[PDB]
A paper describes a structure:
The first two steps in the pathway are catalyzed by the enzymes nicotine oxidoreductase (NicA2) and pseudooxynicotine [name] (Pnao), which convert nicotine into pseudooxynicotine (Pon) and Pon into 3-succinoylsemialdehyde-pyridine, respectively. Enzymes of this family use a flavin adenine dinucleotide (FAD) prosthetic group to accept a hydride from their amine containing substrate, forming an oxidized product and reduced flavin hydroquinone (FADH2) in the reductive half reaction. However, our lab recently demonstrated that NicA2 is instead a dehydrogenase that uses a cytochrome c protein (called CycN) as a biological oxidant.
The structure of the Pnao monomer has a similar overall architecture as NicA2 (39% identity, RMSD of 1.5 Å), firmly placing Pnao in the flavoprotein [name] enzyme family. Trp364 forms the backstop of NicA2’s substrate binding site and forms hydrophobic interactions with the pyridine ring of nicotine; replacing it with Ser372 in Pnao allows for a more extended substrate binding cavity that is presumably better able to accommodate the more extended Pon substrate relative to nicotine. Several of the aromatic residues in the substrate binding site of NicA2 (Trp108, Tyr214, and Trp434) are the same or similar in Pnao (Trp113, Trp220, and Trp434) and may promote the hydrophobicity of the “aromatic cage” commonly found in flavoprotein amine oxidases.
Residue numbers in the entry:
A (entry chain A): 13 to 59, 62 to 448
B (entry chain D): 13 to 60, 62 to 449
Write the structure that this text describes.
């Protein structure tokens, strides 16, 4: 064998696993399909901006541990956690109110929608602590549950906006239990949830953290080297790529679950990987940055995934400077809006911010990038209880890792780091046992 | 030089630092004065397994929770403090008892007033001086100073006194108000999460199991029962003198409790912050003990102010109830008030809180008189945060410093030790790599 460990995928999961493995003394190679590391995090420059994963918080043990580990610093996005004005669409009409006034409505709705989170996920990092209680509800979509609640249509519409934002899809495709999971990870507190999901970002960019972790390790890296076949025998794994064939005692498959079909495995992978590679998680929407000429202040908008007025489930202020306001925008379906068509985005903004002039608009297409085939991972109904454990399971000398199968903040950067660290430790232990 | 890194102290901070450094390829030696690793964590047996020091953890604690998951460890629950059935409390020399919810009405109203400014002082609890000016304005207050300015009943004030004395492990006028604020801010500004964070979850296999996993993931030599006496540094090396040998390294990580700083002779002498903290000490100076009573008392939680005429204990709560009766955890603000290892004295002291209990067993480790700790967990006195934290953390030549006593976040906790040790170990690895 040429290597002790080969890691397929150079996202945070694969990089963290490679650090764990190499620092334990194992000869490790990273094979990365793109011409860059980072995967679904991508720090670039527009005119330095984050084209993918962005926000972090100290409710996320691993990513915060690493940030402090390397002396990085964080800045604030203002719009979601501390807006001045809240705009929301209900029954195809647009309402606007002081943030406190809007959050009365939205928070009462939340009190209703999250009432069972404590019963389902008392230990958010131990998914199956309440296996029976979770199994009883895992068949519910976010919409299925919403419609059972005693709320006004307005409350339901705000919750629709919120849940569609969380799952990055229409609410009937997103698992209700996953919504509960987010709430429980935020210490069963709505303010803590807002602070955790869209407020703090690494001052020097996610790439700086990724690089600190890589420098802390001792792994070889081959970029622009897509893996095509993985063959496993009793002694080794043979990983075939477009640019060479490599052998290792153990291989950590750290690719997006939505891409599992894209490699030929012998033996074939278990039915859980096959089923999730077929169905995919729910993350399949649009995220974009919009520069507007006007100074609109700190706004937060809510619109149902399906409404007659705007394609955006939410838009909010990132920051306001001399050039106007930078907004972050989410939509549940790229069929609704071309986030890179400036005139289309401007039109889509008119009902929420009448009169805004779009100076610029950009969004990376994670859905059609063959190396992601989607955005951040949120399970569809039934997927947690059916597949999580089966997804994590090692198969022979093949190990599996990623936020897409993390126990806690699955779907976040923190999930990638947590899962990669544990899986790398397991791989090192396995090799020591032999 | 004999080593790249010598780590003085085999607590969680030093153990984490030693892992960080050795896994970076550096030849690392740990020197530990006691005959064991763990420092102020000590997993022992009381009639066959108890934690005599650091015990409770939570996922609001990034480093220790990261490590717990890293190694696949599990947690159990202490029931008494976070989910009692009955709360007993002492106010104005009276003892009241009520269903937990009723007691928490009073205690929670008091808390709502006492913590109202935490958000303004520590918006980023892991970044101590983010709001430096606001913190400097209040850092001169003791917990008692602030309490007496509040619009509360004497009952509310007495419950708050109990709580603040429990947190600081000392009398409330010795504890910094800002430190109380920090605990609240680290608990995400909500009392339920604070209760869950400070006394609820414990590692099923004991703190030593995590300490051992960290050590096994590393590659460092260990010398136990080898107290350091002198540390001398020049431009090229550090010479560390112990009772059992002399060792040299390019860099030395000093990971001892600040309360012990005076006990090693440093040449050149250390900066004024280290000396001032070794003189003044943090506030942690109380009693912690395990008590077995024959009776099944249920899940109780008690509150008594640090100075009261009824009992020496600031709080007692149920750890668990099994066939042998009730195991309770007891805290006192002053070792002069109760001999935690005198069974009859403890039984007497418990009578007003749990009238009729028969004490079958009682044990508490004396961290105050142990020369290797000289105190319990670190909570700063007034002024100490803003005057000393940064200078305490400062590297001096080839000397680096680490410990829970100087962490940015959960300072005073296991999480703080792991966090600070990781940062300092990474800094040492960087420094030594640069020299090559
Ligand atoms: C639009 C968007 C916004 C987000 N915002 C946030 C946020 O604010 N906060 C947050 O915490 N998270 C956010 N996330 C989620 C976060 O970015 C990801 O969950 C995390 O980066 C996933 O890391 P990973 O290592 O598990 O997988 P990935 O990052 O997807 O890494 C997988 C890697 O494998 C490579 N690969 C795939 N197939 C092959 C192959 N055959 N051969 C070789 N290499 C291959 C890919 O190129 C990629 O480099 C966001 C995600 C999206 C899509
Ligand atoms: C009673 C009590 C209860 C606690 N409960 C909790 C809890 O529930 N949860 C929590 O998170 N934290 C708790 N803590 C705090 C926690 O135990 C400590 O904060 C943490 O262990 C600090 O570790 P450290 O590595 O920074 O220093 P320490 O663990 O104190 O160890 C420093 C080491 O230096 C060694 N040393 C000292 N002098 C010398 C010398 N001259 N030569 C060589 N070695 C030397 C010591 O022997 C020791 O091993 C508690 C503390 C106490 C006292």
């Amino acid at each position: 064998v040429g290597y002790d460990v080969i890691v397929i995928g150079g996202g945070f999961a694969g990089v963290t696993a490679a650090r764990e493995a190499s620092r334990s003394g194992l000869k490790t190679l990273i094979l990365e399909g793109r011409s860059r590391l980072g995967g679904r995090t991508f720090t670039s420059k527009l005119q330095k901006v984050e084209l993918g994963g962005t926000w972090v918080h100290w409710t996320q043990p691993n990513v915060w541990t690493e940030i402090m580990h390397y002396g990085l610093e964080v800045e604030e996005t203002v719009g979601l956690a501390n807006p001045e004005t809240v705009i929301w669409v209900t029954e195809d009409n647009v309402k606007r109110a002081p943030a406190a006034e809007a959050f009365e409505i939205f928070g009462s709705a939340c009190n209703e929608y999250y009432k069972e989170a404590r019963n389902i996920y008392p230990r958010p990092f131990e998914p199956f602590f309440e296996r029976k209680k979770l199994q009883h509800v895992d068949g519910l979509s976010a919409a299925d549950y919403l419609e059972k609640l005693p709320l006004t249509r307005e409350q339901k519409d705000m919750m629709d906006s919120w849940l569609s934002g969380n799952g990055h899809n229409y609410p009937e495709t997103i698992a209700y239990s996953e919504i509960m999971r987010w709430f429980a990870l935020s210490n069963f507190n709505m303010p803590t949830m807002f602070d955790s999901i869209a407020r703090y970002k690494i001052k020097t960019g996610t790439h700086s953290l990724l690089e600190a972790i890589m420098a802390d390790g001792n792994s070889e890296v081959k970029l622009s080297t897509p893996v095509t076949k993985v063959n496993q025998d009793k002694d080794k794994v043979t990983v075939t790529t477009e640019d060479g064939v490599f052998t290792a005692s153990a291989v950590i498959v750290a690719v997006p679950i939505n891409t599992l079909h894209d490699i030929e495995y012998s033996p074939k992978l278990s039915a859980a990987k096959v089923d999730m590679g077929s169905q995919r998680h729910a993350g399949a929407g649009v995220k974009g940055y919009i520069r507007v000429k006007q100074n609109v202040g700190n706004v937060m908008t809510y619109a149902p995934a399906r409404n007659k007025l705007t394609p955006f489930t939410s838009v909010f202020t990132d920051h306001v400077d001399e050039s106007g306001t930078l907004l972050i925008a989410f939509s549940a379906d790229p069929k609704l809006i071309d986030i890179n068509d400036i005139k289309a985005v401007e039109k889509a903004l008119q009902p929420l911010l009448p009169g805004v002039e779009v100076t610029a608009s950009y969004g990376y297409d994670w859905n059609l990038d063959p190396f992601s085939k989607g955005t951040w991972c949120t399970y569809r109904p039934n997927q947690t209880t059916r597949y999580l454990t089966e997804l994590q399971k090692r198969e022979g000398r093949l190990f599996f890792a990623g936020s897409d199968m993390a126990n806690g903040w699955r779907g976040f950067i923190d999930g990638a780091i947590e899962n990669g660290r544990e899986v790398g430790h397991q791989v090192a232990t396995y090799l020591k046992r032999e």
